[PDB]
Each structure stands twice: as structure tokens, then as C-alpha cells.
């Protein structure tokens, strides 16, 4: 939703990182806010932004909505 | 944002799951 605020400026973040191998100097090369996440270069925020998802709450209800569907299959 | 959960799940699926899963699959060769 911070990306929704400024879709030109802010880079779309992927999942966060947990390396125990990033010693100190790596972590300064990944901090984007509090997160150290990867930058999601897979076009997903664009498609979810044209769908009409404008929150994280709809993403949680959708994620549960596909855990249910994978349990169905 | 439960920020502590990758510090649990990334090791327990990253390393100890391909230890015990090596045990389950490799003993499962002989079961």
C-alpha cells in the first residue's frame, strides 16, 4: 500500500530476507524502510493494483482464499 | 508483522528440514 501511494517512486518490495550470512555491510545495501526485502521484479503489484487490491487486508483474505482452494484441490 | 518468524522458519525449513527429510527419504529408500 506504500507502493500504491507512489507507484512511480517506490520500488515494489518482494519478501524479506533472513540471512545469517549478511554480516554488516550487506544489510545497508538492502534496507528499504524497516524491511531489508528484495525488490519484486515480477510485475505483481501492477496486476494486483489493476485488479483493485488497494490494501494488505484484501491480500490476506485472498491468501487464505487460496490456501482454502489448495486444500480443495 | 511478526518479524521473529523468519528467524524460526528459515532455519527449521532451510537446514533441519533437509536433514530429517534426508533421513525420511533415505531410510524410505529401504522401507
Amino acid at each position: 500500500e506504500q507502493w500504491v501511494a507512489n507507484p512511480l517512486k517506490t520500488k515494489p518490495l518482494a519478501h524479506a530476507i533472513w540471512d545469517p550470512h549478511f554480516g554488516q555491510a550487506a544489510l545497508k545495501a538492502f534496507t528499504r524502510g524497516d524491511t531489508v526485502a528484495n525488490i519484486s521484479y515480477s510485475g505483481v503489484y501492477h496486476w494486483w493494483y489493476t485488479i483493485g487490491i488497494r490494501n494488505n487486508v484484501e491480500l490476506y483474505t485472498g491468501a487464505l482464499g487460496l490456501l482454502v482452494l489448495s486444500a480443495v484441490f | 508483522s511478526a518479524s521473529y518468524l523468519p528467524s524460526i522458519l528459515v532455519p527449521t525449513v532451510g537446514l533441519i528440514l533437509p536433514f530429517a527429510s534426508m533421513a525420511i527419504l533415505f531410510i524410505a529408500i529401504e522401507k
Binding site: 490476506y60 491468501a63 | 508483522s1
Partner: peptide, 27 residues
């Protein structure tokens, strides 16, 4: 954005994991 929904998520995919091992030990 919260924490409890993450617990609910790993509950639902833990159950889905039980269907994964459940389907896995029949084929």
C-alpha cells in the same frame, strides 16, 4: 500488517500440509 492473521495462515497451510502428506501417501 498484523500478527494473528499470520498464525491463521500457517494454521491453514499446516492443515493443507496434512492434505499434502495425506494425498502423498496414497498414490
Amino acid at each position: 500488517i498484523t500478527d494473528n492473521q499470520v498464525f491463521v495462515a500457517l494454521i491453514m497451510a499446516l492443515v493443507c500440509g496434512y492434505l499434502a502428506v495425506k494425498l502423498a501417501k496414497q498414490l
